[PDB]
Design a binder for this molecule. Structure first.
Ligand SMILES: CC(C)(COP(=O)(O)OP(=O)(O)OC[C@H]1O[C@@H](n2cnc3c(N)ncnc32)[C@H](O)[C@@H]1OP(=O)(O)O)[C@@H](O)C(=O)NCCC(=O)NCCS
Ligand SMILES: CC(C)(COP(=O)(O)OP(=O)(O)OC[C@H]1O[C@@H](n2cnc3c(N)ncnc32)[C@H](O)[C@@H]1OP(=O)(O)O)[C@@H](O)C(=O)NCCC(=O)NCCS
Lengths: 162, 163
């Protein structure tokens, strides 16, 4: 019905499409500046900066536009000074017409295996307070709630400090 | 006076000490379940899960207990699906007796050099919202302030799903 597997270079175009689809639930699609080239260069070179799992369905189940990828998860490893290695889930999305069949659960299942393989102590991720569905989805699977502010110094200034 | 250089498996004992001295300010130096072994394996094994810059002072300026490492920065690369790779500064600390001389600024110049090398579009990090001097310390360096809820799925549960 569907296969959850590691992403490949040729999946990048599908990954970009879903990232954007995910940005429509935030009403900021125009905010995505990454291209298929950036994704290939950043995820499939010598040193990947991210890792991806995708959901591929059979031909008689592709989208009308002809896409074979209907879901994905983007993640990377982070480190915590107190407990160590963590698996950080950055994005997680399943297209509308492909929800309810267990794709999301299968993806989380593969993410858990990647985590145990990493010897990671936990998997962390963000969830919008207003997206109850995703909340109840994660809660039923062991997730639990976990005063600082995120600052940013752009290249502009970084280059100056250098 | 001082020198900032990348860490080595040898400095892990000192990195741990600084991690704990920082946690002390919150009386939570017992929350640190990490040991020198972990930092060495996680940091200098086949795959580095973090990177550290240490501040080293000459024997003339060692500490009462005789340590040459008076500060560090722990970082790793992250990714944002909208803009790309970022350099994420996880921890940044300098022993109290040693701040004010320019060690932190030196560490930031190096992190900046790493960010330019990675060709990272930005460096993210957490700042205590209530901390005014800190905020401005960063705002003076080009820093600018940026309803989500942080969740975690611990090991027990990950093991359930993975089997
Ligand atoms: C949360 C999300 C990422 C998980 O992906 P998914 O592929 O659908 O995942 P799964 O197929 O394994 O099932 C997830 C859930 O949908 C719920 N579900 C399945 N069929 C459903 C239906 N017909 N009506 C309402 N909920 C339903 C399930 O109860 C299940 O959560 P639970 O096992 O913790 O009770 C995705 O469902 C989503 O973006 N949801 C937003 C809200 C929405 O589309 N509603 C869910 C209807 S299926
Ligand atoms: C934040 C921190 C890392 C900065 O490092 P540091 O060693 O103090 O770094 P610096 O000495 O370069 O601090 C810069 C300041 O010291 C003084 N300073 C630095 N070099 C100087 C020089 N050559 N001449 C005169 N003053 C100087 C200045 O007032 C200067 O502030 P400015 O650069 O905005 O004008 C350090 O204060 C610390 O570890 N924080 C406190 C511990 C804590 O609770 N925080 C950790 C959470 S991140």
């Amino acid at each position: 019905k569907f296969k959850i597997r590691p992403a490949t270079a040729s999946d990048c175009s599908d990954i970009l499409r879903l990232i954007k689809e995910l940005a429509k639930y935030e009403y900021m699609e125009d905010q995505v500046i990454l291209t298929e080239k950036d994704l290939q260069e950043d995820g499939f070179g010598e040193h990947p900066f991210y890792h991806c799992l995708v959901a591929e369905v059979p031909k008689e189940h592709w989208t009308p536009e002809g896409h074979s990828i209907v879901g994905f998860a983007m993640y990377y490893f982070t480190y915590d000074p107190w407990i160590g290695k963590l698996l950080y889930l950055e994005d997680f999305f399943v297209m509308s017409d492909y929800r309810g069949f267990g794709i999301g659960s299968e993806i989380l299942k593969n993410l858990s295996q990647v985590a145990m393989k990493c010897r990671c102590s936990s998997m962390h991720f963000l969830v919008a307070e207003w997206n109850e569905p995703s909340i109840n989805f994660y809660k039923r699977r062991g997730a639990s709630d976990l005063g600082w502010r995120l600052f940013k110094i752009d290249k502009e200034y970084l280059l100056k400090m250098a």
